[PDB]
Amino acid sequence: PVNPCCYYPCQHQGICVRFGLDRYQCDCTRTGYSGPNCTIPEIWTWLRTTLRPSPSFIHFLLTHGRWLWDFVNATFIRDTLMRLVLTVRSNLIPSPPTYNIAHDYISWESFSNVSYYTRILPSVPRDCPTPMGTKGKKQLPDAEFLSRRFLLRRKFIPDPQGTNLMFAFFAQHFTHQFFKTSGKMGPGFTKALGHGVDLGHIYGDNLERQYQLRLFKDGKLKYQMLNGEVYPPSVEEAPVLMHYPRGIPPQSQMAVGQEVFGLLPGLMLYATIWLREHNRVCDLLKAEHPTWGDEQLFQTARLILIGETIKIVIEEYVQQLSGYFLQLKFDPELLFGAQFQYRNRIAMEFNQLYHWHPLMPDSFRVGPQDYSYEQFLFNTSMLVDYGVEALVDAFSRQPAGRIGGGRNIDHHILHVAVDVIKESRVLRLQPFNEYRKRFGMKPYTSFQELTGEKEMAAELEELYGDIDALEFYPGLLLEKCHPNSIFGESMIEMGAPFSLKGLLGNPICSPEYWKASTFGGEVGFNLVKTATLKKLVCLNTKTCPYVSFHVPD
Amino acid sequence: PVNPCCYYPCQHQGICVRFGLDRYQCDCTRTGYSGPNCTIPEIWTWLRTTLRPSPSFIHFLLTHGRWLWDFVNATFIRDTLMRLVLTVRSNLIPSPPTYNIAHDYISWESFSNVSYYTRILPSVPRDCPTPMGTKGKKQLPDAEFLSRRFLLRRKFIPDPQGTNLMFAFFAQHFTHQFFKTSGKMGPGFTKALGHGVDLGHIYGDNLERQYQLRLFKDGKLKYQMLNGEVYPPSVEEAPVLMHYPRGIPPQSQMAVGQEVFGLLPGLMLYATIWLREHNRVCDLLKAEHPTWGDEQLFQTARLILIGETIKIVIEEYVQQLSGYFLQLKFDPELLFGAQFQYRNRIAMEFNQLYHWHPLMPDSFRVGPQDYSYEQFLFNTSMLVDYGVEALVDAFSRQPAGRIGGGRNIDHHILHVAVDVIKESRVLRLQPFNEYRKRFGMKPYTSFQELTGEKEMAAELEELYGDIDALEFYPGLLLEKCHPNSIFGESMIEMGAPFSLKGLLGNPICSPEYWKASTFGGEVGFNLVKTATLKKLVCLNTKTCPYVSFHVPD
Ligand SMILES: *[C@@H]1O[C@H](CO)[C@@H](O[C@@H]2O[C@H](CO)[C@@H](O[C@@H]3O[C@H](CO[C@@H]4O[C@H](CO[C@@H]5O[C@H](CO)[C@@H](O)[C@H](O)[C@@H]5O)[C@@H](O)[C@H](O)[C@@H]4O)[C@@H](O)[C@H](O)[C@@H]3O)[C@H](O)[C@H]2NC(C)=O)[C@H](O)[C@H]1NC(C)=O
Ligand code: HEM
Ligand code: HEM
Ligand SMILES: *[C@@H]1O[C@H](CO)[C@@H](O[C@@H]2O[C@H](CO)[C@@H](O)[C@H](O)[C@H]2NC(C)=O)[C@H](O)[C@H]1NC(C)=O
Ligand SMILES: *[C@@H]1O[C@H](CO)[C@@H](O[C@@H]2O[C@H](CO)[C@@H](O)[C@H](O)[C@H]2NC(C)=O)[C@H](O)[C@H]1NC(C)=O
Ligand SMILES: *[C@@H]1O[C@H](CO)[C@@H](O[C@@H]2O[C@H](CO)[C@@H](O)[C@H](O)[C@H]2NC(C)=O)[C@H](O)[C@H]1NC(C)=O
Ligand SMILES: CS(=O)(=O)Nc1ccc([N+](=O)[O-])cc1Oc1ccccc1
Ligand SMILES: CS(=O)(=O)Nc1ccc([N+](=O)[O-])cc1Oc1ccccc1
Ligand SMILES: CCCCCCCCO[C@@H]1O[C@H](CO)[C@@H](O)[C@H](O)[C@H]1O
Ligand SMILES: CCCCCCCCO[C@@H]1O[C@H](CO)[C@@H](O)[C@H](O)[C@H]1O
Ligand SMILES: *[C@@H]1O[C@H](CO)[C@@H](O)[C@H](O)[C@H]1NC(C)=O
Ligand SMILES: *[C@@H]1O[C@H](CO)[C@@H](O)[C@H](O)[C@H]1NC(C)=O
């Protein structure tokens, strides 16, 4: 008999469980609901969901009326909201983590094995009629045509929010510390066992390699002087597995924490910058703490750097993305109010959703020059050629591709998207609509409602058969976007909760850790609290270029 | 200049941080105290401190009167106070963990590398005048001498609280899933990565081993029939690493989660009991969910068994230890409205502290027979000679040693305590009196004040020279004990916090994992909710013998 759970009977986060031959039962525990399917709301829950504004109304608010916000921001109401965002958003995320590619149920192996990604919804069961559960055609839409007809850029669409490539690369850099899928273990598994902001893209994902990159004098990282400027050393000087092409000089290969960073100067730029930062922070620390050995200098530098990273991403990166008039604020003290887990596990869903390749331009402009993809990719000298200042000026001046709304991925990298989808299908990821519901939205009733348009819609309608067969990742990228926006509500509402839980769940945000001691006292603590994209750059260079996550005017 | 931190100048959980060449300061963040040393109370601390009664008094409060208590046990107050104890206890233990053998400060490697035991107090700094700080003599007392004069059991001192061997062997069994110190990596590193109640000692601490122990059918572990009884498999059938006397026939080796267990019949008794429970639990699962595969059946029964353990540990084990009239309760829902991190990292001090070898008797009486050590140790046929029922009955009946009070370790195992102190000095554990302060107790001012009696104090008084020299382990075992207690206040007052954090800082007890579905429904959940030592044994044996953590009336 057909598998009942395959209908996803359990609403509102109830857990569908098989009993006897073909019965099921939903466990409605702590859902706010009861009944066979968790649809009968408790007194407080009914109260809640009717007095609750729709996500878009809230967004509208946060993005309109400067006059109210000028006010709010300068008063404490700035913090009440920040607290609210933090706790409400994060709540959507199970911690301790629930499921993994192997387990569709809570298990110890699931909980203790950090090589796995987690997931918020269970897989689509194998014993099921259609690969998306119950709805749609037998064999799913072709991955390659889907990317061609819908994600392949025709002409270039700059982000209407003015996001620059400075941002784009920072995202790529930043994220490739917690997304590193295992080649050898395959889909659903991960190298990045820090599972968040450990900065393992600077100090590597392992101790042994970490050790290889370290000077072991003064808490510092190894480095090479070139044209008077500091850079990550060569693989000959610091011998770690780096994914450069073969034949390429280990004498040209640069050594950073993330094996793939040698492949784009974008990444190699930030690896440079963060390295200078780290060494720079060591210099400061050794002035106040001369009695300190080498080890306590490195480990402290790393905290500060972890601290700095979270401060910026929150107060600048997410700001840019949100466009909110409310100024966001990094302050773990907001979270000492309520029940919070300073623990994070990366979901496969988060992975899928962060494949932000659209941001990537038709070509890369460095003042007068116009380097193509082939010219840019795997370049072994561009970084050293221009230096940091010059390549910060350039990335900060170039508009990035809008993410949502479709047809805005450059053909050079469209194969990523293809794989993401194909990868999605191996992972038996649930339908997009099933994820709407789980991230507190209504499901879309049609393809029209999704795209806010007819042509793509009715075209997808027939490829996919039903809208409840629409997949996660395609769905995120094809949904309509309010003009003036970088992407669609589902990206915000699905991503934000994975995003914030990933930032604040870090243990340096705990009552235990968030003290000055942790950061070698007050200069250490103040460095975290006042850290900036400008500062991070212009403190570590001879001159100071346009630095920002947005283009100038 | 001498390192200022050597003085432990900083009170009530402040952090001594070395600054410049010869100075220091204290980070007294969130301590409740201000000032350079941190002895200047905030309004709230003072009130809280002039009105807090002593441990003596609370111990007295729970250990005396019964009328009041059997009343309290029938009201909501049981839950009220139970919660007080948990929160009170577990808030003294940092979470995220703080330091380890290598780092005397918070660091990422210390957050991240679970192969370390954590530590509540930092190590006595390597640049200090005396091995214990500043107070005391150049040489700590000879460890073997300290043992032989103070801990060697002359006459057997039975536990005044009636503790039996059945408890003793339970304590060992249970505690040996989270203390697996490296023979290889050395002092202060762990093989048992669960850092808690994960039943590694049953399923092995690694995936390789677990697979080898698993029958991979119905979710069961392998077993063999000897005399019609289910015992753990042979090593030929489950080829895993087990420590056995070389020369012992392979058919006579039993394979279990934990490598040492095969030595002592005690151990291999519980290993057998639990194994039987596991398979038994699968036999209830498969009936409920015949569609379920062996992996789920396996991982679900595991959670039921982890749950069953804590239930028994809290409601029966820790209850027996306490002598409290407060009926202790395992109810995770008690913490559901509170800052509580559902994690735990094992500490050296817990390991040290948990060395209750003074539990073990002179001989081991089994029915008409009385067994010497040279007869009990490593006996491989004994468990299978008498069978579970007959051996449980015999451990339940024989008294266990009194733990505190001094001179209660049998000579046969006296070398253990010798290594404990030795290791204590490799781990540079701070002096007893500092651990006193960390756990919200007043330090001792005289060796006289410590033991109570006049004689044995004054010998130490001359061995150590000064009370602030006295060592962690020794102080524990030599401290005067409350009116008829199994050990002194310090053990209680230091142990329990770790103890409790060790049970309830377990994801299973989290809001996320504490639902019927985690255990495959009501049936599983009710076994957790309703388990008893008596039931863990008798539901698995032909007849039901005497079983209990206390010797009879
Ligand atoms: C949790 O924590 C445990 C404790 O840290 C970890 O186990 C330890 O892992 C480290 C891995 O490095 C071990 O550290 C030791 O370090 C010494 C240091 O001496 C250095 O040797 C280097 C050798 O490099 C040599 O030269 C070239 C270039 O320099 C190298 O590329 C080449 O490989 C060559 O051999 C020197 O470069 C350096 O100058 C020093 O002389 C090293 O010699 C030891 O062999 C050892 O590696 C440590 O011993 C491990 N275990 C223990 C008990 O300490 C554990 O890994 C961690 N767990 C996790 C999951 O991360
Ligand atoms: C020209 C620039 C870029 C290149 C060359 C590139 C290339 C790649 C490649 C080859 C992969 C592996 C996919 C596969 O083999 O199937 C990948 C994965 C990924 N990319 Fe990009 N990408 C670029 C831009 C970006 C940017 C700007 C982001 C930031 C949002 C991003 C986010 C990701 C993520 C999250 C993954 C998954 C990582 C993993 O699981 O290992 N990419 N990228
Ligand atoms: C006759 C029975 C016992 C014997 C033969 C025994 C002997 C030993 C031995 C040989 C060790 C290992 C020390 C080393 O690593 O060199 C040890 C450690 C230990 N014992 Fe026992 N002991 C017994 C009973 C107990 C009891 C009743 C307890 C209370 C729970 C206990 C608790 C511990 C603990 C916590 C360790 C340290 C384990 C680790 O660090 O991995 N032991 N004992
Ligand atoms: C966590 O889970 C993975 C998946 O089970 C573990 O790896 C597999 O282990 C088995 C037995 O050791 C092998 O047959 C597989 O080939 C391994 N790899 C894969 C991709 O399945 C991994 O060992 C676990 N991690 C830890 C720390 O135990
Ligand atoms: C890597 O980038 C460098 C520049 O940083 C490329 O060389 C430059 O090419 C431009 C024209 O595209 C010239 O105006 C400059 O004279 C060149 N600079 C140097 C130092 O040669 C180089 O071609 C790129 N690498 C690859 C493989 O295309
Ligand atoms: C703060 O702690 C320090 C360190 O123990 C104390 O400073 C000592 O004070 C003595 C007199 O008691 C002086 O003679 C020494 O110079 C100090 N020693 C060190 C190592 O600094 C001080 O007493 C404490 N202050 C308070 C108010 O408790
Ligand atoms: C302030 S927040 O809710 O915590 N996050 C957030 C809010 C809005 C937007 N956005 O692009 O409008 C983007 C946001 O951040 C995201 C980051 C990654 C993925 C999704 C959202
Ligand atoms: C109820 S509790 O505070 O959580 N623990 C506890 C309390 C008292 C006693 N006791 O022997 O009176 C023993 C106790 O149990 C342990 C003491 C030390 C180590 C482990 C358990
Ligand atoms: C009970 C909650 C009251 C708020 C109604 C929520 C639905 C409104 O919906 C929102 O309206 C905004 C109006 O300015 C539009 O700009 C948004 O796009 C739209 O989603
Ligand atoms: C002007 C009001 C701003 C403060 C309210 C913070 C709400 C944070 O955003 C809320 O997060 C929830 C989790 O994704 C969503 O379900 C809500 O629709 C979303 O707006
Ligand atoms: C619950 O959902 C199942 C499957 O979605 C459906 O068949 C059933 O009718 C529903 N029951 C109730 C009471 O709403
Ligand atoms: C082991 O135990 C059995 C029965 O309990 C006993 O007869 C036998 O002699 C013992 N072996 C040793 C080596 O003491």
DSSP secondary structure of A510-524: STTT-SSGGGTHHHH
Task: Give the determination technique.
Answer: X-ray
Q: CA–CA separation, A19 vs B521, rounded Å?
A: 9
In B, minimum Cα distance to A306 occurs at B108
Q: Which residue has its alpha carbon closest to ligand 5 atom 11?
A: A369
Neighbours of A195 (CB within 10 A): 22
Centre of ligand 1 to C-alpha A208, Å, is 6
Q: Residue A35: how many CA atoms within 13 Å on its side-chain side?
A: 14
Interchain contact, A103 vs B207, CB within 8 Å:
no
Q: Does the N-terminal peptide bond of residue B96 adopt cis geometry, omega within 30 degrees of 0?
A: yes
Q: CA–CA separation, B326 vs A201, rounded Å?
A: 52
Interchain contact, A299 vs B108, CB within 8 Å:
yes
Task: Assign 3-class secondary structure to A209-269.
Answer: HHHHHECCCCCCECCEEECCEEECCECCCCCCCCCCCCCCCCCCCECCCCCCHHHCHHHHH
Mapped onto helix, strand or coil, the DSSP state of residue A284 is helix
Q: What is the dihedral of CA B321, B324, B326, B331, to 10 degrees?
A: -10
Q: CA–CA separation, A141 vs A129, rounded Å?
A: 16
Q: CA–CA separation, A494 vs A350, rounded Å?
A: 8
Mapped onto helix, strand or coil, the DSSP state of residue A428 is coil
Centre of ligand 12 to C-alpha B375, Å, is 6
Mapped onto helix, strand or coil, the DSSP state of residue A130 is strand
Q: CA–CA separation, A415 vs A412, rounded Å?
A: 8
Here the tokens at position A348 are: 């496969």
Centre of ligand 4 to C-alpha B216, Å, is 15
Q: CA–CA separation, B357 vs B203, rounded Å?
A: 25
A510 lines ligand 5 (CB under 6 A): no
Q: CA–CA separation, A19 vs A103, rounded Å?
A: 18
Angle (deg, nearest 10), helices B165-175 and B265-288: 70
Cβ-based contacts of A30 with chain B (< 8 Å): 511, 515
Neighbours of B405 (CB within 10 A): 21
Here the tokens at position B135 are: 């107070």
- Spatial contact of A467 and A63, defined as CB atoms under 8 Å apart: no
Closest ligand 1 atom to B189 CA: 53
- Amino acid making up residue A528: V
Which residues have CB under 8 Å from A1's CB, separation 6+?
A21, A22
Q: Where are the alpha helices (DSSP H) in A355-446?
A: 373-376, 382-397, 414-426, 432-438
Q: CA–CA separation, B544 vs B533, rounded Å?
A: 12
Angle (deg, nearest 10), helices A294-312 and A265-288: 130
A372 lines ligand 5 (CB under 6 A): no
Nearest to A194 by CA among A178, A176, A172: A178
Q: Is A285 left (phi over 0), alpha (psi -120 to 50) or beta?
A: alpha
By CB atoms closer than 10 A (0-12, 13-18, 19+), residue B43 is exposed
Q: Residue A328: how many CA atoms within 13 Å on its side-chain side?
A: 22
Q: CA–CA separation, B374 vs A366, rounded Å?
A: 82
Q: Which residues of B313-327 are buried (b: 16+ CB within 10 A; e: fewer)?
A: bbbbbbbbbbbbbbe
Which residues have CB under 8 Å from A293's CB, separation 6+?
none
- Spatial contact of A407 and A152, defined as CB atoms under 8 Å apart: yes
Centre of ligand 6 to C-alpha B430, Å, is 20
Interchain contact, B15 vs A106, CB within 8 Å:
no
B496 lines ligand 8 (CB under 6 A): yes
Q: What is the dihedral of CA B449, B451, B456, B458, to 10 degrees?
A: -10
Interchain contact, A515 vs B27, CB within 8 Å:
yes
B326 lines ligand 8 (CB under 6 A): no
Neighbours of A448 (CB within 10 A): 16
Min distance A254 CA to chain B CA atoms (Å): 24
CB contacts < 8 A (A, B):
156
- Amino acid making up residue A483: P
Element (H, E) at B350: helix B348-353
Q: CA–CA separation, A475 vs A498, rounded Å?
A: 18
Q: CA–CA separation, B541 vs B391, rounded Å?
A: 12
- Cα dihedral sign for B499, B504, B508, B514? positive
- Spatial contact of A258 and A199, defined as CB atoms under 8 Å apart: no
Neighbours of B42 (CB within 10 A): 12
Nearest to B523 by CA among B324, B333, B288, B291: B288
Choose the closest CB to B29 out of A289, A342, A516: A516
B357 marked as part of a ligand binding site: yes
Backbone φ and ψ of B400, nearest 5°: -110, 160
Nearest to A267 by CA among A376, A156, A399: A376
A182 lines ligand 4 (CB under 6 A): no
Interchain contact, A299 vs B25, CB within 8 Å:
no
Centre of ligand 12 to C-alpha B110, Å, is 47
What is the radius of gyration, based on Cα positions, of chain B? 24
DSSP string, A145-174: HHHHHHTB-SS--B-TT-BBHHHHHHHHHH
- Amino acid making up residue B34: S
Which residues have CB under 8 Å from B379's CB, separation 6+?
B265
Interchain contact, B105 vs A339, CB within 8 Å:
no
Scan for tokens 């037998």, then name that residue. A138
Find the catalytic residue in B176, B201, B278, B482: B176
Number of H helices, E strands in chain A: 22, 8
Find the catalytic residue in B354, B386, B435, B473: B354
Which residues have CB under 8 Å from A82's CB, separation 6+?
A326, A328, A329, A331, A334
Closest ligand 6 atom to B4 CA: 20
Interchain contact, A511 vs B337, CB within 8 Å:
no
- Amino acid making up residue B437: K
Choose the closest CB to A343 out of B299, B343, B513: B343
- Spatial contact of A502 and A361, defined as CB atoms under 8 Å apart: no
Which of B5, B7, B17, B128 is the best mutation target for the ligand 6 pocket, counting ligand atoms within 8 Å of the beta carbon and taking the most?
A: B7
Min distance A41 CA to chain B CA atoms (Å): 18
Scan for tokens 């014993």, then name that residue. A127
Scan for tokens 């046969």, then name that residue. B412
DSSP string, A68-87: HHHHHHHSTHHHHHHHHHHH
- Cα dihedral sign for B480, B483, B488, B490? negative
Angle (deg, nearest 10), helices B489-504 and B55-63: 70
Neighbours of A270 (CB within 10 A): 27
- Residues of A designated catalytic: 176, 354
Mapped onto helix, strand or coil, the DSSP state of residue A373 is helix
Backbone φ and ψ of A10, nearest 5°: -85, 110
State the pairing for strand pair B364-366/B229-231: unpaired
> How far is the CA of A161 from the CAs of A366, A485, B134, in angstroms?
22, 6, 63
In B, minimum Cα distance to A517 occurs at B27
- Amino acid making up residue A346: I
Cβ-based contacts of B295 with chain A (< 8 Å): 102-103
Backbone φ and ψ of B75, nearest 5°: -125, -175
- Amino acid making up residue A164: N
B99 pairs with which residues across the strands? B119
By CB atoms closer than 10 A (0-12, 13-18, 19+), residue A356 is buried
Q: CA–CA separation, A128 vs B178, rounded Å?
A: 41
DSSP string, B467-523: TTT--HHHHHHHS---TT-SS-HHHHHHHHHHHHHHHHSSGGGSTTT-SGGGGTSHH
DSSP string, B55-121: HHHHHHHHHS-SHHHHHHTTSTHHHHHHHHHHHHHHTTS-SS--EESS-SS--HHHHH-TTB-EESS
Q: What is the dihedral of CA A331, A336, A338, A341, to 10 degrees?
A: 80
Nearest to B174 by CA among B33, B314, B55: B314
Annotated resolution, angstroms: 2.8
Backbone φ and ψ of B224, nearest 5°: -135, 155
Which of B2, B90, B512, B528 should be substituted to probe chain A, the one whose Cβ sees the most A Cβ atoms within 10 Å?
B512
Scan for tokens 């012992």, then name that residue. B248
Among the bound ligands, name the one nearest to the CA of residue B9: 6
> How far is the CA of A191 from the CAs of A107, A181, A188, A196, A421, in angstroms?
21, 6, 11, 12, 21
Centre of ligand 10 to C-alpha A344, Å, is 21
The DSSP symbol for A197 reads S
Q: Residue A119: how many CA atoms within 13 Å on its side-chain side?
A: 24
Is residue B354 annotated as part of the catalytic site, yes or no? Answer: yes
- Spatial contact of A379 and A499, defined as CB atoms under 8 Å apart: no
Q: Which residues of B524-539 are buried (b: 16+ CB within 10 A; e: fewer)?
A: bbebbeebebebbbbe
End-to-end CA distance of chain A: 63
Mapped onto helix, strand or coil, the DSSP state of residue A400 is coil
Q: CA–CA separation, A342 vs B365, rounded Å?
A: 50
Q: CA–CA separation, B426 vs B123, rounded Å?
A: 9
Neighbours of A524 (CB within 10 A): 23
Q: Residue B437: how many CA atoms within 13 Å on its side-chain side?
A: 16
Here the tokens at position B493 are: 């007052």
Cβ-based contacts of A19 with chain B (< 8 Å): 288-289, 521
Which of A22, A25, A37 is the best mutation target for the ligand 11 pocket, counting ligand atoms within 8 Å of the beta carbon and taking the most?
A: A37
Q: CA–CA separation, A4 vs A125, rounded Å?
A: 10
Interchain contact, B105 vs A198, CB within 8 Å:
no
- Greatest C-alpha distance within chain A: 73
By CB atoms closer than 10 A (0-12, 13-18, 19+), residue B245 is exposed
Q: Which residue has its alpha carbon closest to ligand 7 atom 7?
A: A322
Q: Is B12 left (phi over 0), alpha (psi -120 to 50) or beta?
A: left
Scan for tokens 């005017």, then name that residue. A553
Nearest to A521 by CA among B127, B93, B16, B438: B16
The DSSP symbol for A399 reads B
Nearest to B286 by CA among A18, A127, A521, A192: A18
The DSSP symbol for A194 reads T
> How far is the CA of B309 from the CAs of A417, B223, B270, B315, B528, in angstroms?
47, 21, 12, 10, 8
Q: CA–CA separation, B340 vs B361, rounded Å?
A: 40
| Cα angle: B116, vertex B122, B127; to 5 degrees | 115
| Cα angle: A450, vertex A452, A454; to 5 degrees | 100
Q: Is A369 left (phi over 0), alpha (psi -120 to 50) or beta?
A: beta
Here the tokens at position B502 are: 């060790």
Closest ligand 12 atom to B378 CA: 13
Nearest to A117 by CA among A188, A197, A205, A193: A188
Closest ligand 4 atom to A185 CA: 20
Domains in chain A with CATH codes: 2-42 (2.10.25.10), 43-552 (1.10.640.10)
Choose the closest CB to B112 out of A103, A194, A296: A194
